[PDB]
């Protein structure tokens, strides 16, 4: 398939596909490297501005995959064009941290900070270095300090939330995801994650809030089945708890029953695609019937 894929392709399509890969910031270091050196040896003619980012992405992938030879091959080419550039320095420090002798990359980062006071990338890389070197608490402390000093980066917020997830600290993660949802209210993914975190916390009021935020993101996109599953489970759990009002129990039961019919039909019209989908349909049908007998 390698030669077959290499036959029915043009360089323009390769470059467009890699640009889309960079836009989606996916992890396909194997495929990024596989197409990387190919356009480097086949075309190697024009698109220097593109080929600089191409080189950087290729060596980023090679650092992950298996190959430092191509990493240095792209580093020397990047250094040839730009003699003084902080991006090349950051990439070299990343590779150094990958190999050995983390402290050298460290003082490289302090020299970078001494030259340019405003360098978020170097501080982020130092934070990631101490994330894996020592405990996560110190890394959280430095991330909080940097987030105080900038209060600009959403990636920092999401990284702090992810780090707090491992510590079973959903109280602070709730604030983090609320802040992240502030800037992007149309992103249903953050809403789903926030409802997930709130449901994990527990409590009837948290259950109701999580259910309502599950329902909000359900109408924004109409693409996700995770949110509807979470909503149905929240309704079932609020039905289970004795500390509730009668009418709220009836309406939550109605919500769960409607979600059950939505599940049934979604699996139903998926059955015409293949012939093995009937077994999944009957599996989910018995699942929903058992939970319906449980609820009723």
């Amino acid at each position: 398939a390698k030669v077959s894929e290499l036959y029915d392709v043009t360089w323009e399509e390769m470059r467009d596909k890699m640009r889309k890969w960079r836009e989606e910031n996916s992890r396909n270091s194997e495929q990024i490297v596989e197409v990387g050196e190919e356009l480097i040896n086949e075309y190697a003619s024009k698109l220097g501005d593109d080929i600089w980012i191409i080189y950087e992405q290729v060596m980023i992938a090679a650092l992950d995959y298996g190959r430092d030879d191509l990493a240095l091959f792209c580093l020397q080419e990047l250094r040839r064009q730009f003699p003084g550039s902080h991006r090349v320095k950051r990439l070299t420090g990343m590779r150094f941290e990958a190999m050995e002798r983390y402290d050298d990359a460290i003082q490289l980062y302090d020299r970078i900070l001494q030259e340019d006071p405003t360098n978020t990338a170097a501080r982020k890389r130092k934070i990631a270095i101490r994330k894996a070197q020592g405990k996560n608490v110190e890394a959280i402390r430095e991330l909080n300090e940097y987030l105080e000093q900038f209060v600009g980066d959403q990636e920092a917020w999401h990284e702090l939330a992810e780090l707090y997830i491992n510590e079973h600290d959903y109280a602070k993660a709730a604030f983090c995801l609320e802040e992240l949802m502030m800037t992007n209210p149309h992103n249903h993914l953050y809403c789903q994650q926030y409802a997930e975190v709130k449901y994990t916390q527990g409590g009837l009021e948290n259950l109701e809030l999580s259910r309502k935020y599950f329902a909000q993101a359900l109408k924004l996109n109409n693409r996700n089945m995770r949110a509807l599953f979470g909503l149905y489970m929240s309704a079932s759990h609020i039905a289970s708890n004795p500390k509730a009002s009668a009418k709220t129990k009836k309406d939550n039961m109605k919500y769960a029953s409607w979600a059950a019919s939505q599940i049934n039909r979604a699996y139903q019209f998926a059955g015409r695609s293949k012939k093995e989908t009937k077994y999944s349909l009957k599996a989910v049908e018995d699942m929903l019937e058992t939970l319906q007998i449980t609820q009723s």
């Binding site: 309502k212 693409r223 919500y255 979604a266 019209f269």
Partner: protein, 52 residues
């Protein structure tokens, strides 16, 4: 750039108090009584694409 931090801070401080709160999440009943048919015209056009 301009160095009028004090008056800007005071203006923002009073403007923030002037804002009210209206939770837009309470209006959940609108979605419950509705129809879900986009999720299968959408689902029909997701099936043809294969895996590279």
């Amino acid at each position: 750039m301009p160095a009028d931090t004090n008056k800007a801070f005071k203006t923002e401080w009073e403007a923030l108090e002037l804002t009210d709160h209206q939770w837009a999440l309470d209006d959940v009943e609108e979605e419950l009584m509705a129809k879900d048919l986009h999720f299968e015209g959408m689902f029909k056009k997701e099936l043809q694409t294969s895996i590279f």
